[PDB]
Write a protein that holds these residues in place. Structure first.
Motif, PDB file in Angstrom:
ATOM      1  N   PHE A  21      23.059  46.314  40.481  1.00  4.25           N
ATOM      2  CA  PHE A  21      24.385  46.432  41.074  1.00  4.25           C
ATOM      3  C   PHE A  21      25.426  47.205  40.267  1.00  4.25           C
ATOM      4  O   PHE A  21      26.548  47.405  40.737  1.00  4.25           O
ATOM      5  N   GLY A  22      25.047  47.658  39.074  1.00  2.00           N
ATOM      6  CA  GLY A  22      25.967  48.374  38.210  1.00  2.00           C
ATOM      7  C   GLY A  22      27.152  47.510  37.833  1.00  2.00           C
ATOM      8  O   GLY A  22      28.254  48.010  37.618  1.00  2.00           O
ATOM      9  N   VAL A  23      26.927  46.201  37.782  1.00  4.97           N
ATOM     10  CA  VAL A  23      27.956  45.258  37.359  1.00  4.97           C
ATOM     11  C   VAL A  23      27.626  44.757  35.951  1.00  4.97           C
ATOM     12  O   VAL A  23      26.571  44.155  35.729  1.00  4.97           O
ATOM     13  N   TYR A  24      28.523  45.023  35.003  1.00  4.97           N
ATOM     14  CA  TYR A  24      28.207  44.843  33.590  1.00  4.97           C
ATOM     15  C   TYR A  24      28.899  43.638  32.988  1.00  4.97           C
ATOM     16  O   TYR A  24      30.125  43.533  33.020  1.00  4.97           O
ATOM     17  N   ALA A  25      28.099  42.734  32.438  1.00  2.73           N
ATOM     18  CA  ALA A  25      28.605  41.601  31.682  1.00  2.73           C
ATOM     19  C   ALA A  25      27.830  41.504  30.375  1.00  2.73           C
ATOM     20  O   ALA A  25      26.778  42.133  30.212  1.00  2.73           O
ATOM     21  N   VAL A  26      28.345  40.711  29.448  1.00  2.00           N
ATOM     22  CA  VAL A  26      27.673  40.492  28.176  1.00  2.00           C
ATOM     23  C   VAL A  26      26.484  39.565  28.409  1.00  2.00           C
ATOM     24  O   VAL A  26      26.503  38.741  29.318  1.00  2.00           O
ATOM     25  N   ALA A  27      25.449  39.702  27.589  1.00  2.00           N
ATOM     26  CA  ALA A  27      24.212  38.961  27.807  1.00  2.00           C
ATOM     27  C   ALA A  27      24.432  37.447  27.773  1.00  2.00           C
ATOM     28  O   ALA A  27      23.708  36.699  28.413  1.00  2.00           O
ATOM     29  N   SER A  28      25.450  37.006  27.045  1.00  2.00           N
ATOM     30  CA  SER A  28      25.815  35.587  26.996  1.00  2.00           C
ATOM     31  C   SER A  28      26.390  35.102  28.317  1.00  2.00           C
ATOM     32  O   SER A  28      26.598  33.897  28.509  1.00  2.00           O
ATOM     33  N   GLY A  29      26.656  36.039  29.223  1.00  2.00           N
ATOM     34  CA  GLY A  29      27.298  35.713  30.482  1.00  2.00           C
ATOM     35  C   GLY A  29      28.817  35.791  30.408  1.00  2.00           C
ATOM     36  O   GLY A  29      29.501  35.481  31.385  1.00  2.00           O
ATOM     37  N   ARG A  30      29.350  36.184  29.250  1.00  2.00           N
ATOM     38  CA  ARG A  30      30.792  36.342  29.101  1.00  2.00           C
ATOM     39  C   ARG A  30      31.308  37.412  30.049  1.00  2.00           C
ATOM     40  O   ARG A  30      30.709  38.475  30.177  1.00  2.00           O
ATOM     41  N   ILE A  31      32.423  37.129  30.709  1.00  2.00           N
ATOM     42  CA  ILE A  31      33.065  38.130  31.535  1.00  2.00           C
ATOM     43  C   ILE A  31      34.538  38.302  31.191  1.00  2.00           C
ATOM     44  O   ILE A  31      35.237  37.337  30.838  1.00  2.00           O
ATOM     45  N   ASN A  32      34.992  39.549  31.288  1.00  2.00           N
ATOM     46  CA  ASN A  32      36.390  39.882  31.110  1.00  2.00           C
ATOM     47  C   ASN A  32      37.063  40.074  32.475  1.00  2.00           C
ATOM     48  O   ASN A  32      36.869  41.084  33.148  1.00  2.00           O
ATOM     49  N   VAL A  33      37.850  39.078  32.853  1.00  2.00           N
ATOM     50  CA  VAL A  33      38.508  39.006  34.141  1.00  2.00           C
ATOM     51  C   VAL A  33      39.472  40.179  34.363  1.00  2.00           C
ATOM     52  O   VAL A  33      39.707  40.592  35.499  1.00  2.00           O
ATOM     53  N   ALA A  34      40.014  40.734  33.283  1.00  2.00           N
ATOM     54  CA  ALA A  34      40.855  41.931  33.393  1.00  2.00           C
ATOM     55  C   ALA A  34      40.068  43.159  33.884  1.00  2.00           C
ATOM     56  O   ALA A  34      40.650  44.169  34.259  1.00  2.00           O
ATOM     57  N   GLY A  35      38.744  43.065  33.890  1.00  2.00           N
ATOM     58  CA  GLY A  35      37.931  44.128  34.437  1.00  2.00           C
ATOM     59  C   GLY A  35      37.877  44.073  35.959  1.00  2.00           C
ATOM     60  O   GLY A  35      37.287  44.940  36.596  1.00  2.00           O
ATOM     61  N   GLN A  70      45.676  35.898  35.574  1.00  2.00           N
ATOM     62  CA  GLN A  70      45.650  34.680  36.396  1.00  2.00           C
ATOM     63  C   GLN A  70      45.401  34.975  37.878  1.00  2.00           C
ATOM     64  O   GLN A  70      44.709  34.211  38.572  1.00  2.00           O
ATOM     65  N   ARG A  71      45.972  36.074  38.363  1.00  2.00           N
ATOM     66  CA  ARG A  71      45.760  36.474  39.749  1.00  2.00           C
ATOM     67  C   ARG A  71      44.303  36.853  40.010  1.00  2.00           C
ATOM     68  O   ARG A  71      43.753  36.510  41.046  1.00  2.00           O
ATOM     69  N   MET A  72      43.678  37.548  39.063  1.00  2.00           N
ATOM     70  CA  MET A  72      42.267  37.902  39.194  1.00  2.00           C
ATOM     71  C   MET A  72      41.369  36.665  39.127  1.00  2.00           C
ATOM     72  O   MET A  72      40.383  36.578  39.864  1.00  2.00           O
TER      73      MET A  72
END
Lengths: 400, 400
Positions: free
Chosen positions: A369-383, A323-325
């Protein structure tokens, strides 16, 4: 004399999850940010063993005197804790002895066992899942010979749960169908029904007669242990039959020990016994009996007041960090000049959200940018961490 | 209205084992002897955790830093150790990269993964198993829609392997079929093909073109680790394709941690890699990835010189206690006046044999003497001790 049995087998398509991971590893650039992972990470980017779990493991090392087979349904105490956690202390379902629980190799194992059970013993032929849903739902249900249909769920352009669309698309679902719902922290959207919405859904299932299947893998990651089960309990209060596939992979950080359960609910004890006997048969024809270590760890923790308190505190720390992230992400993008509103991230819960980025932006984010997300645009906020947030956000702003 | 989906489920028939176990636990007679157990037991009637295992478990407790998911095929080092143990170090199969191994939840899981893989990716419609065989064999293959047929194996009147009848009955098996062999310590008869019979069987498989599936759950319980793999290796040298389902449940006394593997072998590295990609999909659709604890215990033991020496001595003691009980059983029967030849018991391998008793004699043994066998007359010589041998044998002589 004879040609091979394997010779004409065709190569499976490459696993994109594994593909993305391999790519990340080969990338030697130092400032990389991995929002593509499917697991919790702490502020140092690790996935440590919980303290409560280390202590329970130490206890087991000191006290176990045999590794002899568990029965088909696993450790009975794990079964009991599971049902309490799911339905709540002093539930009429439990009181009426209407639930039976089999410990399984993860929630995945639970889903497979449910599928095999359904295919061989009932007239269920079709399973409804949300668009989008967890990637492995379709394959699991298809492997048992069950058709998988999608219902309306997420409004991608507006970052919302389109409830009217959901209700309307389900009108096509008949008595004899199964309808799968995520207990909480919908994966991958992070948007769940409100209580009132859960109640409307429960009512509808009774009216149309279909069978609810609740896939609950993130209890405790949304609002809290009891709040996260509220939806499931709305269904339990109304529908006389239920299937629940639960997981401790995430709320205990026990991923690799394969810890979960499949719980059957019927109108009464006698009825659930008949059903559950056939579920045992599906298990016997699969992996025979479930693995002890992980489930024993969970039973040990929940049965011990001190350990349980330690576990609840770590889990709370994890829910709160996520939640903080979310909050920090939204504030930092805005501060970095994002030409767009990302406040939907705050209205969502769990590790995952759809970023709303295009596959072209995702690609540019990784390549440049070496910033990795899933092709669907899904992101893991814990990252995300306080230390990687600024560069991360600067990258995202640069690709909008 | 909408009737129950479960309402009408017909219950599975009870596992007669469970009923018999209840009877045993409720039996208050001080003299009761349990020969129906399905696991190893030491001279005190216990199934302890091996010392090598406890030591490895301490190492894991002290050194594991995460529980994140294993890959679909498990711990790579567990795969490598499995392959060396099966085929032998410096094996041409390994050098040539013709083998791929997935860590699975037990030998049972490996059998189920093998069946799913075959049903979905090949023309295999039929699996041949010995009469008799491991009781769960049929359910597992049936669950994947594979037909199960029986080939001739045990001559129950004479307590022998009727090799000639085996060969002849396998004339019915076709090029597109699978034929399953127990690697060693045939369960439940304890009679294995000789090396020459193994070589003949391998030749035949090449001649007829069916695919051998080797179920190997007792490597080390027969004559020794290397000797017990002789049969498998004779197949490996001959037939270009193979499936092996191996287990660590018995040889590491790791039953309930569910440690095993499915290994594919093909003509060349390209073909096996291709086939194995499809095997992974079969796992992904089932339990997703295997449990770490037990497999990591095994990899830790086999990777460490000292731990390995401790484990091999423990397994040797187990192997030798089983041999002593077989010898003592035969001699004590003679002593108590059997006067019927029971020497077949010495020629057999592992903890199981068919006693050759009728279901009437089995019943009488339990009711009159508190000696418990399974209805089939299967006995587990590890339920025998120097202390219960005399009354046990007197009981048997009395019902003959």
């Amino acid at each position: 004399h004879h040609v091979g049995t394997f010779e004409n087998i065709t190569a499976a398509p490459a696993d994109p999850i594994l593909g993305l991971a391999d790519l990340f590893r080969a990338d030697e650039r130092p400032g990389k940010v991995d929002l593509g992972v499917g697991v919790y990470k702490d502020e140092t980017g690790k996935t440590p063993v919980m303290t409560s779990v280390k202590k329970a493991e130490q206890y087991l090392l000191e006290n176990e005197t045999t590794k002899t087979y568990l029965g088909i349904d696993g450790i009975p105490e794990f079964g009991r804790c599971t049902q309490e956690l799911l339905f709540g202390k002093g539930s009429a379902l439990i009181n009426d002895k209407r639930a039976r629980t089999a410990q399984t190799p993860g929630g995945s194992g639970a889903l497979r066992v449910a599928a095999d059970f359904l295919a061989k013993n009932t007239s269920v032929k079709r399973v409804w899942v949300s668009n989008p849903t967890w990637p492995n739902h379709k394959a699991i249900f298809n492997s048992a010979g069950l058709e998988v249909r999608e219902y309306a769920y997420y409004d991608a352009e507006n970052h919302t749960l389109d409830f009217d669309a959901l209700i309307n698309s389900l009108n096509e679902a008949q008595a004899g169908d199964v309808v799968l719902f995520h207990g909480c922290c919908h994966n991958p959207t992070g948007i769940d029904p409100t209580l009132e919405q859960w109640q409307t859904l429960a009512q509808l299932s009774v009216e149309k007669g279909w069978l609810p299947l609740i896939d609950i893998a993130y209890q405790g990651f949304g609002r809290g242990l009891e709040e996260d089960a509220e939806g499931l309990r709305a269904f339990a209060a109304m529908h006389k039959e239920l299937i629940v596939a639960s997981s401790c992979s995430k709320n205990f950080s026990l991923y690799n020990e394969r810890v979960g359960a499949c719980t059957l609910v019927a109108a009464d004890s006698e009825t659930v016994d008949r059903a559950f006997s056939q579920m045992k048969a599906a298990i016997r024809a699969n992996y025979s009996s479930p693995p002890a270590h992980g489930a024993s760890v969970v039973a040990t923790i929940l049965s011990n007041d001190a350990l349980r308190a330690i576990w609840e505190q770590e889990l709370t720390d994890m829910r709160q960090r996520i939640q903080r992230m979310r909050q920090l992400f939204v504030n930092t993008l805005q501060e970095k000049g994002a030409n767009r509103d990302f406040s939907f991230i705050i209205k969502q819960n769990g590790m995952f959200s759809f970023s709303g980025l295009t596959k072209e932006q995702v690609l540019r984010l990784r390549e440049e940018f070496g910033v990795y997300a899933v092709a669907s645009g899904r992101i893991n906020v814990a990252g995300m961490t306080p230390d990687n947030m600024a560069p991360l956000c600067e990258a995202i702003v640069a690709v909008l």
